[PDB]
Amino acid sequence: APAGLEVEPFPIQMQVILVGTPEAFEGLEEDPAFSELFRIRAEFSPTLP
Amino acid sequence: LDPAQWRPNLLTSSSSGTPPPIVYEPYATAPRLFGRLDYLVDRGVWSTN
């Protein structure tokens, strides 16, 4: 494309509920920005009583 | 004489001075820091001004 569009920043009103297998987050928790953004770890117990 | 090639290109304007221009640029890539030089296509010919 010769010339794009300068899209302005947008305040985000959504909330992101990621879903992932724990080793998929083992490679994604290295960022301190991940800890700052996603603060609620909803972890599913692999075994029920 | 090309009208596009001789025109002062507005970059910004200061209706202010309190506060001073505070430009937080977290995505400091070269196009986002120094600006873009977009082109116009004239029959497959790249042109700029």
Q: Do B1 and B49 touch, CB atoms closer than 8 A?
A: no
Residue among B40, B44, B37 at smallest CA distance from B2:
B40
From CA B24, how far away is CA A9, in angstroms rounded? 12
Q: N- to C-terminal Cα distance for chain A? A: 58
Q: What is the resolution of this structure in A?
A: 3.4
B42 in contact with chain A, both atoms CB, cutoff 8 A = no
Give pairs for A4-8: CB < 8 Å, separation 24+.
Answer: A4/B36, A4/B38
Q: Do A38 and A18 touch, CB atoms closer than 8 A?
A: yes
Experimental technique of record: cryo-EM
The conformation of residue B44, written as its DSSP 8-state character, comes to: T
From CA B25, how far away is CA B22, in angstroms rounded? 10
From CA A41, how far away is CA A17, in angstroms rounded? 10
Alpha helix locations (H) across B1-49? 30-34
Closest approach of B36 to chain A, Cα-based (Å): 9
Residues of A with CB under 8 A from a CB of B: 2-4
One-character DSSP codes across A13-38:
---------HHHHHTTTT-HHHHHH-
> Which residues of A are less than 8 Å from B41 in CB distance?
2
